[PDB]
Amino acid sequence: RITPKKLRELSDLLRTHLSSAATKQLDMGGVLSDLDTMLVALDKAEREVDKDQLKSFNSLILKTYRVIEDYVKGNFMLSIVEPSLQRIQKHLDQTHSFSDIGSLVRAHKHLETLLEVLVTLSQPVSSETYGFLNRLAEAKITLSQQLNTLQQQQESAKAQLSILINRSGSWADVARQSLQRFDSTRPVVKFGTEQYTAIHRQMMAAHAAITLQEVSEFTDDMRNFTVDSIPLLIQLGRSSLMDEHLVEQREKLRELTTIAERLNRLEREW
To answer: How many CB atoms lie within 10 A of CB 188?
Structure first.
């Protein structure tokens, strides 16, 4: 597990490279090799450190790539480019979820930078350099494509979330209130059949029946709601997404789903 300590240590490395760049002493193989380690770390960290500190670290990384670009505006292949390329190439054979988008975005920026550095460094260009530039570019663009597909799927998922939440307005407040009243006034369930609990058990049935009539006109909608909402919730997951609009919407959808499912189950029980 990535610790606050290790995150600080990685940030100290970035700051060292940044101060180096300011004195025109940037160790290019060093900053690139260190950046790669940080991509692996941040991928992990995000999945499980103050989110505060995680945001600052993503931004320090962006500052560092910015400095690399300015540095180049104004063996390496074998030991620096090649291992990073090979690691990222592994993403291109993996099944992705929405939670991967951030890390694929970062990996793409990383390949772009490797390419930029290699181009500048070689422009006397060898056949071998051209072959590596090809491989790097084919990887980068394959990643771009897989990433675009994933982002489009996410756009569609967010659109469906909005539509579901918006359509739910026809039943949601009345169903929530009706379920609240159920839960607030619910008699104890009795497990026996003794005559002395017959009144309690008739109370159970009568109380259920009030709630079922309040939501009787919504039962189809709530059932069709959950057919759509459950798979979408699984696709959206439970991790921090700080598109904090998205996390708010997601948890609205989850609440609406529990209401619908409770009321769907209650109707089948009675």
So the answer is: 9
Would residue 24 be called left, alpha or beta, if left means φ above 0 and alpha means ψ between -120 and 50 degrees? left
Q: Cα 77 vs. chain centroid, distance in angstroms? A: 33
Q: Are 65 and 205 in contact (CB under 8 A)?
A: no
Q: Give the fold, CATH level 3, of 124-270.
A: Methane Monooxygenase Hydroxylase; Chain G, domain 1 (1.20.58)
Q: How far apart are CA 87 and CA 85, in angstroms?
A: 6
Retrieve residue 189's tokens.
Answer: 């369930």
Same fold, 1-123 and 124-270: no
Resolution (A): 2.0
Closest alpha carbon to 173 in 265, 247, 230, 256 = 256
User: Using the 8-state DSSP alphabet, how is residue 77 labeled?
Assistant: I
Distance (Å, rounded) from C-alpha 18 to C-alpha 60? 9
Amino acid at 259: I
Tokens standing for residue 121: 């460094």
Q: For residue 170, which of 225, 210, 218, 224 has the smallest C-alpha distance?
A: 218
CATH topology of domain 1-123: Four Helix Bundle (Hemerythrin (Met), subunit A) (1.20.120)
